[PDB]
Amino acid sequence: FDIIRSLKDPEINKSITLLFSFLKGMGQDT
Amino acid sequence: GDKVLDILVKKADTEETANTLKNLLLLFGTLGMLDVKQLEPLILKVNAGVASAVEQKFDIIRSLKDPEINKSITLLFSFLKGMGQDT
Ligand SMILES: CCCCCCCCCCCCCCCCCC(=O)OC[C@H](COP(=O)(O)OC[C@H](O)CO)OC(=O)CCCCCCCCCCCCCCC
Ligand SMILES: CCCCCCCCCCCCCCCCCC(=O)OC[C@H](COP(=O)(O)OC[C@H](O)CO)OC(=O)CCCCCCCCCCCCCCC
Ligand SMILES: CCCCCCCCCCC(=O)O
Ligand SMILES: CCCCCCCCCCC(=O)O
Ligand SMILES: CCCCCCCCCCC(=O)O
Ligand SMILES: CCCCCCCCCCC(=O)O
Ligand SMILES: CCCCCCCCCCC(=O)O
Ligand SMILES: CCCCCCCCCCC(=O)O
Ligand SMILES: CCCCCCCCCCC(=O)O
Ligand SMILES: CCCCCCCCC(=O)O
Ligand SMILES: CCCCCCCCC(=O)O
Ligand SMILES: CCCCCCC(=O)O
Ligand SMILES: CCCCCCC(=O)O
Ligand SMILES: CCCCCCC(=O)O
Ligand SMILES: CCCCCCC(=O)O
C-alpha cells in the first residue's frame, strides 16, 4: 500500500523524475 | 619497537579489525574479478545520465513512450538477464 501513496508525494514524484532523467541520459544515442 | 608492535597487535587483534582487513583484501580480489573493459561504456553512460539529471535545474507513463528511455531500460533489462545466468 506504500507505493500508491508514495507516487502522489510531490517529493517522491520529483525524485523519481530525476532518476528517470538519469535513466534517459544513460545509453544516449550520441 | 617491541612495545610498539605489542600495542599494535593488542589493539588490532579484535575480530572487527581482522574482519576489516580480510574484507578489504576480499574487496580487492572481487574488484579484480570484475571485468572493467566492458564497464567503460557503462561509466560513459552513467556520466551522461548524471549530466542529464543535474540538467533538470504522471512521469512514468510519458517516459515509457520515450524511445531513449525505452532503449535504456531495455539495456538495463539485458543487464538484469545477464546476471544470475544459468551457465
Ligand atoms: C471499478 C473500480 C475498480 C477498482 C479501481 C482500481 C483499484 C486499484 C487502484 C490502483 C492501485 C495501484 C495504483 C498504482 C500504484 C503505483 C504504480 C505501480 O503500479 O507501482 C508498482 C509498484 C510495485 O513496485 P516495483 O517493484 O515496481 O517497485 C519499483 C522498483 O522495483 C523499486 O526498486 O507498486 C505496486 O505494485 C503497488 C500496488 C500493488 C498492486 C495493486 C493492485 C492489487 C489489487 C488489485 C485487485 C484488488 C481487488 C479488485 C476487486 C475487483
Ligand atoms: C475504459 C478505460 C479506462 C481507463 C483506461 C486506462 C487508464 C490508465 C492507463 C494506464 C496508466 C498507467 C500506464 C502504465 C505506466 C507505466 C508502467 C507502470 O505501471 O509503471 C510503474 C511505475 C511505478 O514506478 P516503479 O516503482 O515501478 O518504478 C520503477 C523503479 O522503482 C524505479 O527505480 O509508474 C507508475 O506507476 C505510473 C502510473 C501510476 C498509476 C496509474 C493508475 C492510477 C490511476 C488508476 C485509476 C484512475 C481512475 C479510474 C476511473 C475508473
Ligand atoms: C484488497 C486488499 C485486501 C487486503 C490486503 C491487506 C494487505 C495489503 C498489502 C499490505 C502490505 O503490502 O504490507
Ligand atoms: C483504514 C486504512 C488506513 C491506512 C492508513 C495508512 C497510514 C500508514 C501509511 C504508512 C506510512 O505512513 O508510511
Ligand atoms: C485521476 C487523476 C486525478 C488527479 C491526480 C492529480 C495528481 C496525479 C499525480 C501527480 C504526481 O504524481 O505528482
Ligand atoms: C536508441 C539506440 C541507441 C541508444 C543506445 C546507444 C548506446 C549503447 C551502445 C553504446 C556503445 O556502443 O558503447
Ligand atoms: C503542469 C505540470 C508541470 C510539471 C513540470 C515538471 C517540470 C518540467 C520541467 C523540467 C525541468 O527542465 O526542470
Ligand atoms: C493538461 C495536462 C497536461 C500535462 C502536461 C505535462 C507536461 C510536463 C510533463 C513533465 C515533464 O515534461 O518532464
Ligand atoms: C534459472 C536458475 C539458475 C539461474 C541462477 C543461477 C545463479 C545463482 C547461483 C549462482 C551460484 O551458485 O554462485
Ligand atoms: C474515490 C475516493 C476515495 C478513494 C481516494 C483515495 C485517495 C488516497 C491517496 O490520496 O493516496
Ligand atoms: C485516446 C486518446 C487520448 C489519450 C492519449 C494520450 C497519449 C499521451 C502520451 O503520448 O503519452
Ligand atoms: C477498495 C480497494 C481498491 C484497491 C486498493 C489497492 C491499494 O491501493 O493497495
Ligand atoms: C475512482 C476510484 C479510484 C481508485 C484508485 C485510487 C488510487 O490508486 O489512488
Ligand atoms: C482520464 C485519466 C486516465 C488515467 C490517467 C493516469 C495517468 O496517466 O496518470
Ligand atoms: C484508449 C485509452 C488509453 C488510455 C491509456 C493511455 C496511456 O497510458 O498511454
Swiss-Prot record, chain B:
The protein, known as: Uncharacterized protein YjgD
Organism annotation: Bacillus subtilis (strain 168)
Recorded name of the encoding gene: yjgD
Covered range of the whole protein: 63 to 157 of 186
